[PDB]
C-alpha cells in the first residue's frame, strides 16, 4: 500500500462570513491505542486551544473532549481530524496547528486567510 | 509510526516571477524499490509529463528521468518540485503520481500589490 498526499502544510483563502473545512487525516500501518489530537490556533500576539479529541481505535473514529470555539464542528468519514470553522470573522487569520499523539509528535500546518466579500 | 496529511488535493497562489515548490510526498510502511513517479501538466490549451524518474529507495535521492523545460527541478520521501520565475502561463493543474494514489496541485499564479492602502 501507498500513501501519497501533498504534505503536512497548505495554506488556503475563505470569504468572511462563510464556513471552511480545515483538513488533517491521519495514518499509521500500526494499528493503535487511544490517539490524542487537538487543533490550536495562533498569530502574532497570542494562540488559543480550540478543540481537543481521541479516537479509541482505527474501528471509531475521532470524538472530541475539549470545545472552546462552538462554530468548531468535526467531522469527515485514513480517520480524518479535519474541523469544519463556520461563521468565519477576519480575526480568523492565522495558522491552524494539528497535533496528534500515538515517539510520535506529528503536526499538520493550517495558513488560513479570511478574505472579504467584494 | 505516525503520518499526518492535508490532503491529496491543495490550491496554490504562486507570486509572478517568484519561485514557488509543488509538494508531493509519500509514505509507505514496507521498503520500497523502483518507485515510478511522474508529474503532469494539464491546461486548458495543452497536457503534458512534466518530469519523471524513480526512487532508487528510501536510501538515494530521487533520479529525473524526463526533464522538462529549464523551469522545472526536484527537491517521509519527498517529490515536491521546484518551479522558478514563475510566469502567468504556467498556471495549470500539476499532478503528482507514483506508479505501483496521487496528489493534484492546483497553481494559481497572481500578482501582489506592495502594501494595502496607505502604510506607516
Sequence with gaps: ???????????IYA?????????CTFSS????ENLYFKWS????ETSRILIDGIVK???????????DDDRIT?????????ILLSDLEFSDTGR???????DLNNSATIFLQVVDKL
Excluded: H, Q, W
Excluded at 2 to 8: A, H, Q, T, Y
Excluded at 96 to 102: E, G, K, L, P, S
Design 96 to 102: 491552524y496547528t494539528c497535533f496528534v499523539r500515538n
Design 15 to 23: 470569504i468572511n462570513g462563510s464556513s471552511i473545512l480545515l483538513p
Design 57 to 67: 481505535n482505527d474501528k471509531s473514529d475521532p470524538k472530541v473532549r475539549v470545545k
Design 41 to 44: 490556533y495562533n498569530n502574532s
Design 1 to 11: 500500500s501507498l500513501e501519497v498526499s501533498v504534505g503536512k502544510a497548505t495554506t
Design 74 to 82: 468535526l467531522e469527515g468519514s485514513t480517520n480524518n481530524i479535519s
Design 29 to 32: 500501518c500500526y494499528g493503535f
